Amino acid sequence: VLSEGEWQLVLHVWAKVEADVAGHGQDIHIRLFKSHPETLEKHDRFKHLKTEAEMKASEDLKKHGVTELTALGAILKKKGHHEAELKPLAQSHATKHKIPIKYLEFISEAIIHVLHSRHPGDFGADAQGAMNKALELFRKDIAAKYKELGYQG
Ligand code: ZNH
Ligand SMILES: [Fe+2]
Ligand SMILES: [Fe+2]
């Protein structure tokens, strides 16, 4: 459980992400795929894209990153009160996409890196700490939902 001030830091930087959701979602995917290529393989419909510029040019990839980050933003705005939003996400990710919690860790790392690289003046140590705690809470709770579904993430 985060403090009110930690939530405010998370939502303040999130409002910066919302100025360009598509571009942040591209950058986070490209960082994730470069850092951890197995994660590209899980995105079965995007495995063909060869370079960063091919990734940025893909409308399908851009639209997917907006869907992904819109769901995360809706979860963060609930300030931990997110069972209703988490539930369907855990269902699809445990049963259809088969995303292990470790890959949620990898993308949390990519989110922190991209937020820091785009917004350093609004994402210092305290905001980083608050976003880390927010994403750790998301991962803990989605891992409990995975188990409810019979999936060990
Ligand atoms: C932050 C965190 C996160 C979030 C919020 C999300 C969200 C999301 C959403 C909303 C969607 C749509 C719906 C469904 O479910 O299906 C998706 C899809 C999705 N997903 Zn995911 N995710 C994520 C992570 C992820 C990761 C990490 C991975 C890998 C690795 C993934 C993989 C995925 C896939 C593969 C899909 C499908 C895509 C297409 O369309 O193709 N995922 N996703
Ligand atoms: Fe592989
Ligand atoms: Fe994705």
UniProtKB/Swiss-Prot annotation:
Gene Ontology terms describing biological process: removal of superoxide radicals
Gene3D superfamilies per record: 6.10.140.2100, 6.10.140.2110
The answer to whether the entry has keyword Phosphoprotein is yes
Q: Which domain of life is it from?
A: Eukaryota
- UniProt-listed PROSITE patterns: GLOBIN
> Which InterPro entries does the entry link to?
Globin (IPR000971), Globin-like_sf (IPR009050), Myoglobin (IPR002335)
Q: According to the UniProt entry, which residues carry Phosphothreonine?
A: 67
Keywords, comma-separated and alphabetical: Cytoplasm, Heme, Iron, Metal-binding, Muscle protein, Oxidoreductase, Oxygen transport, Phosphoprotein, Transport
The record's GO molecular-function terms, alphabetically, read: heme binding; metal ion binding; nitrite reductase activity; oxygen binding; oxygen carrier activity; peroxidase activity
Cellular component, GO, one term:
extracellular exosome
Q: What class of enzyme is it?
A: oxidoreductase
Which subcellular locations apply to this protein? Answer: Cytoplasm, Sarcoplasm
Write out the residues that bind heme b.
93
Q: How does it assemble?
A: Monomeric.
Q: Which PANTHER family match?
A: MYOGLOBIN (PTHR47132:SF1)
- What protein is this chain from? Myoglobin
To which species is this protein native?
Answer: Physeter macrocephalus
